[PDB]
């Protein structure tokens, strides 16, 4: 097909339980049996206050922890329980989000040709991609790409793959789903893992689905963004800075305190590589979808790139209303951009600007850099 891979619809969905951050220190420390650890609870209240996360949607309730209390421990054998939960619930959320995106797109499911589905959780054979196929009533001929445990930069990875799948198959339509649940990473507090104090402060659950096609039939399909280009890179000698392993106790989690400066330190190179071909120099001339790994990552990006006060508005708002949902996060922000752009009557779906950048930062440390082009409203 002639033209670029285009985002035609976006749907999101979250677990039905909402957790106010003001009240989370009390909750989390109550269900894990850690409320006598007042030193560490205070430390966590500080982390939550400066998190800038106001709500998160979490599938782990107190109910599940009473049924699976191994999960409410730190260290105990718990994978089997987490697995029972996630191989079930990771696809259900995905179906909710995919449903809403397919309804927005508006065409019959007949026409979806490929499914790319990224998840940290529920590693099983057949994969959760298969479960989704059955739950939605997708064509059995759907070409699947199952990406387990990517994870926090996965939002970029899926668009990068979707570009080539949609653009090398005329008439193909790719269903993309990032479905992230924190069931696999949750564990009790300890002064022996501050990275999980951070984690259980910032990370929330959520699923985002989107339909990509090239050469959209403008009779019936409304492109939202075009995927101009997609690059990935490894930040040299930064393995072990963002870490996690599937173990008996669940998914372990480590983030170095240097990750914010690492990303800020390395971002200009990626952004230069991606944008010299367009002869674009001024980083305030493009709209922004940076992964909000936390408020410090965004602070350092602003500082380094000399960004105006408005740039990260959409990203920030998603972080506060939802938290950090790993791969899905940047996709949520896409939705926040196109909607905010419309509710504020901008010239384009990308905050009135023509070009945008979307970045995922994750293990590697990896930077996924994708150039988007906004569509005229």
Dig out the tokens for 185 from the structure. Answer: 């990473």
Whole-angstrom distance, CA of residue 263 vs CA of residue 175: 30
Dig out the tokens for 64 from the structure. Answer: 């599940």
Q: At how many Å resolution was this determined?
A: 3.2
Whole-angstrom distance, CA of residue 1 vs CA of residue 16: 40
Question: Taking Cα atoms as reference points, which of 328, 337, 343 lies closest to residue 375?
Answer: 337
203, 275, 357 from 212: Cα distances, Å: 27, 23, 18
Whole-angstrom distance, CA of residue 17 vs CA of residue 56: 8
Contact 250, 185 (CB under 8 A): yes
Bridge-based pairing state of the strands 287-290 and 366-374:
unpaired
Chain Cα centroid distance, residue 73? 26
Dig out the tokens for 152 from the structure. Answer: 């926090």
CB atoms within 10 A of CB 111: 14
Residue 308 DSSP one-character state: -
Whole-angstrom distance, CA of residue 131 vs CA of residue 129: 5
Whole-angstrom distance, CA of residue 291 vs CA of residue 316: 10
Question: Taking Cα atoms as reference points, which of 352, 374, 363 lies closest to residue 224?
Answer: 374
Active site residues: 152
Technique employed here was X-ray
Question: What is the phi/psi pair of residue 288, to 5°?
Answer: -125, 130
Whole-angstrom distance, CA of residue 311 vs CA of residue 294: 16
Tell me which H or E stretch contains 213. Answer: strand 206-214
Helix (H, G, I), strand (E, B) or coil at 182: coil
Question: Taking Cα atoms as reference points, which of 207, 297, 310 lies closest to residue 257?
Answer: 297
Dig out the tokens for 84 from the structure. Answer: 């029972």
CATH 3.40.47.10 segments of the chain: 5-214, 225-374
225, 226, 265, 374 from 356: Cα distances, Å: 9, 10, 20, 7
CATH architecture of 5-214: 3-Layer(aba) Sandwich (3.40)
Question: Taking Cα atoms as reference points, which of 222, 211, 150, 220 lies closest to residue 180?
Answer: 150
Whole-angstrom distance, CA of residue 277 vs CA of residue 229: 10
Residue 341 DSSP one-character state: H
Contact 226, 375 (CB under 8 A): yes
In order, the DSSP letters of 345-368 are T-SBTTTT-SEEEEEEEETTTEEE
In order, the DSSP letters of 216-278 are --TTT----EEEEEEEEEEPTT-TTSEE--EETTEE--EE-TTHHHHHHHHHHHHHHHHHGGG
Dig out the tokens for 132 from the structure. Answer: 């989704």
Q: What is the CATH number of domain 225-374?
A: 3.40.47.10
Tell me which H or E stretch contains 330. Answer: helix 328-343
46, 115, 283 from 150: Cα distances, Å: 29, 17, 28
- List alpha helices for 10-112, DSSP H: 24-31, 38-49, 62-67, 79-105
In order, the DSSP letters of 129-159 are HHHHHHHHT--TT-EEEEEES--TTHHHHHH
Dig out the tokens for 250 from the structure. Answer: 């669940």
What is the spatial order of strands in the sheet that 173-180 belongs to?
Answer: 143-148, 114-119, 173-180, 206-214, 5-13, 225-234, 366-374, 355-362, 287-290
């Amino acid at each position: 097909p002639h033209g670029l891979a285009s985002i035609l619809a976006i749907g999101t969905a979250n677990p039905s339980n909402c957790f106010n951050q003001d009240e989370f220190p009390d909750y989390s420390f109550r269900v894990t049996k850690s409320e006598h650890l007042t030193s560490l609870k205070d430390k966590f209240k500080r982390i939550c206050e400066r998190s800038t996360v106001r709500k998160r949607y979490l599938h782990l309730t107190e109910e599940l922890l009473q049924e699976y209390p191994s999960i409410a421990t730190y260290d105990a054998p718990s994978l089997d329980a987490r697995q029972e939960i996630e191989v079930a619930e990771v696809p259900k959320l995905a179906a909710r989000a995919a449903s809403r995106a397919i309804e927005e797109w508006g065409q019959p499911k007949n026409k979806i040709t490929h499914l790319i589905f990224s998840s940290t959780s529920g590693i099983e054979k057949p994969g959760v991609d298969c479960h989704l196929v059955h739950l939605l009533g997708l064509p059995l001929s759907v070409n699947r790409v199952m990406l387990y445990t990517i994870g926090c930069h996965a939002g970029g990875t899926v668009l990068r793959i979707a570009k080539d799948l949609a653009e090398n198959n005329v008439g193909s339509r790719v269903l993309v789903v990032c479905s992230e649940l924190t069931v696999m990473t949750f564990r009790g507090p300890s002064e022996t893992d501050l990275a999980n104090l951070i984690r259980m402060g910032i990370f929330g659950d959520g699923a985002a689905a989107l339909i990509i096609g090239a050469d959209p039939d403008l009779s019936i399909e409304k492109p939202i963004f075009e995927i101009f280009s997609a690059s990935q890179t490894l930040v040299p000698n930064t393995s072990k800075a963002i870490r996690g392993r599937v173990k008996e106790m669940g998914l372990t989690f480590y983030v170095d305190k240097m990750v914010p400066t690492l990303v800020a330190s390395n971002i200009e190179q990626c952004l230069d590589k991606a944008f010299s071909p367009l002869g674009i120099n001024d980083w305030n001339s493009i709209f922004w979808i940076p992964h909000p790994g936390g408020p410090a990552i965004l602070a350092e990006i602003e500082a380094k790139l000399e960004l105006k006060p408005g740039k990260l508005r959409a990203t920030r708002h998603v972080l506060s209303e939802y938290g950090n949902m790993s791969g899905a996060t940047v996709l949520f922000i896409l939705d926040e951009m196109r909607r905010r752009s419309k509710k504020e009557g901008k010239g384009t779906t990308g905050d009135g600007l023509e070009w945008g950048v979307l970045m995922g930062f994750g293990p590697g440390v990896t930077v996924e850099t994708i150039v988007l082009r906004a569509i005229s409203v």
